[PDB]
Amino acid sequence: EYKTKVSRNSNMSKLQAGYLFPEIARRRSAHLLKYPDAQVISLGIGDTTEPIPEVITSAMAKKAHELSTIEGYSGYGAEQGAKPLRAAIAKTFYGGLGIGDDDVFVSDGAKCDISRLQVMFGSNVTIAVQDPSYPAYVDSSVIMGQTGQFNTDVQKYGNIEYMRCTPENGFFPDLSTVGRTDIIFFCSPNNPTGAAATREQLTQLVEFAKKNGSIIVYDSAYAMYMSDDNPRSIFEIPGAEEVAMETASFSKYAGFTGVRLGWTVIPKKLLYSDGFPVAKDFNRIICTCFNGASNISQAGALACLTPEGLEAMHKVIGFYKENTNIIIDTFTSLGYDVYGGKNAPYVWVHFPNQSSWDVFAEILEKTHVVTTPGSGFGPGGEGFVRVSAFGHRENILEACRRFKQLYKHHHH
Amino acid sequence: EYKTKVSRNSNMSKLQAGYLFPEIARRRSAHLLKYPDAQVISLGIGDTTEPIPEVITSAMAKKAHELSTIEGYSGYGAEQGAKPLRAAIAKTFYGGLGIGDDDVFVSDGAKCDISRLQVMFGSNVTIAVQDPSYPAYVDSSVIMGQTGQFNTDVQKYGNIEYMRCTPENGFFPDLSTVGRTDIIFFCSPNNPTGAAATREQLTQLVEFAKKNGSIIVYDSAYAMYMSDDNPRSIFEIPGAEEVAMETASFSKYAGFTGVRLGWTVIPKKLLYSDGFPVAKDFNRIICTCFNGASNISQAGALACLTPEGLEAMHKVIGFYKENTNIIIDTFTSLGYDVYGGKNAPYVWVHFPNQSSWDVFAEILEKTHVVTTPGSGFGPGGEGFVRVSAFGHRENILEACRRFKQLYKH
């Protein structure tokens, strides 16, 4: 067989396996070969299951129809996004926090923004992540060349600062034990633990970043699920504008998981060590490596940020919050320690003295329910299982009755 | 003022200025400040102007409505793209060329694919590009750290192999003078020259890559504008499957510039030096760094690849090709050497002994038409100007009558 003379990217070689969620998909397929008549319920990947509100899809269809008229047709948008959408985002989510429309960059999703920010930061930065955290932060770091090899003894890539978040520290890092890095990826409410940082904790985080001269990348993707009285944006902390940016998405709010629209906010006071504004490099990246969110997706997002859109999103979020309460009540009834669920549409269940992949496998085998093993979100990680609350009501109720059957003899 | 201690990415510092088209749009904005009532006609960035056919928009609207029903709602799609769409692409554009549905990766656009491919290749590869060429290839290379600084004496970034394409060589490089690199970015029909490589030239390119152990990244974004009888896909050349991948987009065929859908084709027999298949690393990038093309955009694309869709696209393409002819006849009547326009919806006009940025500025100032200066596409480059054919018929006619008035005399 012919082979080229080009070397495989050594950063790709550093990666341990496939992305977590593809590997789950594999095990689910293998399960269905074993049990062809199983009624599988997926509470794994956090994918929304209910229809997008009519107020939102009507706007998208209307925009689509307009594209076939002389008067309504539009080509390329500004790659930062439509001005009225940037304005609406700035007002709706950041009004009072000193964010201008020009600080908002509209994307096709937070996942893709993470990787574009990582292209911008480059191979020479060091990163810190919550441990556990959404696996894309770590994986994007490895791909960009920011790390060493994976150490199988500690289950960590070298040169990443994994800030451990545990029942014993209230799922917020002990910052006095955290080494300096250039970047700090910080998610609140956190995926997978569900923990939302308090104002006092975020204040300490900003103070930490300011003293270390770090940039915080704040992921507020689940902030609309907040029930506790905690900040929804990092920009609520005075000083955040000198050390933080924020990334977010409509995915979990509007059912936009397949529609594709997010944003990143980068303040004017966020500067590199030479005084260069970070937002100017992001703008370069966005103009050269991206061609903007879909015009139809942008019109949907614009429809969301209206009285009727906002009411529709509250109703949807409210439905998934009650799904999460059912799940919480289920595991608590069975005697497990269950974390999260209060401020986020998933629960973080403690299965001490077992490996999370084993618990994942046992739940899948016995109940035909897919969950997510905690070690998929990093070594801190082990052994919790994340259970998603997204699903039709009857599917959630049925999953929970299957859990009850599986776990009835465990406690006490 | 407070500054962090994070060091600016030194690859960002390398970049000589803003991206080409934003910098033009700035000059356009300054012009409208100076003359608020100027009737500006834009023939700069190749943005489509005609409405998307109803067959396509009706499919997208229907998909949008379906997302509001229990039965029609869908969340995350496969990051690689809906299997029926990957199948439609494989069959429609590559049927008979040995391309399987699993070799197709559906994206939100070719510009974004070039960047994802460059993340995949990483910092340690060297690149060759046509000179002139579409600026994203070079800029993505600089961003990924594949280059040195910009050299102002030659107008080139260090460590990039600029393959010279000229009227004199038929806009195809003398491959015996081209140094070995890992990657060869090749556009056919080329943007900005309009030149479409013949089957023999492409055969030479494949033979060149094979003996050098290079990967060709073939950009066929304008291939549907082909008039000459030349290959539309690199995979028409036997042996391309061992050395080449292809990228393309719906933007220019369906007016999708704002809708967002393209694809990359990576063949099973394309392997890194250690035997590892390239498509496998691409798939890993796509699962980690991307969440899939919009479901509505995929529905629109699926409707394009039907008899009705293909008919609509043929009609729109034919319209823009007539526009191009008008532009060619205009500049030829004025005594300019004009290249391209046969196989692409833009014309490459030679303005001898003059700076293309100066020409761009004169045209804008005097006629209120925006063009693209050739130096924007690299040192080879100077001083040509690219004129796009995308526009309502009346605006193309008006723009041409403005050029005639300015130059005729």
From Swiss-Prot, chain A:
GO molecular function, one term: L,L-diaminopimelate aminotransferase activity
Subcellular location: Plastid, Chloroplast
Pfam families: Aminotran_1_2
Signal peptide range in chain numbering: none
Binding site for pyridoxal 5'-phosphate: 76, 110-111, 134, 191, 222, 249-251, 260, 291
Cofactor dependency: pyridoxal 5'-phosphate
Tissue expression as described in the entry: Highly expressed in seedlings, roots, stems, flowers and leaves. Lower expression in siliques.
E.C. numbers: 2.6.1.83
Keywords: Aminotransferase, Chloroplast, Plastid, Pyridoxal phosphate, Transferase, Transit peptide
Residues with N6-(pyridoxal phosphate)lysine modification: 252
UniProt-annotated binding residues for substrate: 19, 46, 111, 134, 191, 291, 386
Catalytic reactions of this protein: (2S,6S)-2,6-diaminopimelate + 2-oxoglutarate = (S)-2,3,4,5-tetrahydrodipicolinate + L-glutamate + H2O + H(+)
Summary of the knockout phenotype: Embryonic lethality.
Alphabetized CDD domains for the sequence: AAT_like (cd00609)
InterPro entries reported in the protein's UniProt record: Aminotransferase_I/II_large, DapL/ALD1, PyrdxlP-dep_Trfase, PyrdxlP-dep_Trfase_major, PyrdxlP-dep_Trfase_small
Induction details: Not induced by pathogen infection, but down-regulated by dark treatment.
GO annotation, cellular component aspect: chloroplast; chloroplast stroma; plasma membrane
Note: The expected covalent binding of pyridoxal phosphate by Lys-252 has not been observed in the 3D-structure.
Subunit structure, interactors included: Homodimer.
Listed name of the protein: LL-diaminopimelate aminotransferase, chloroplastic
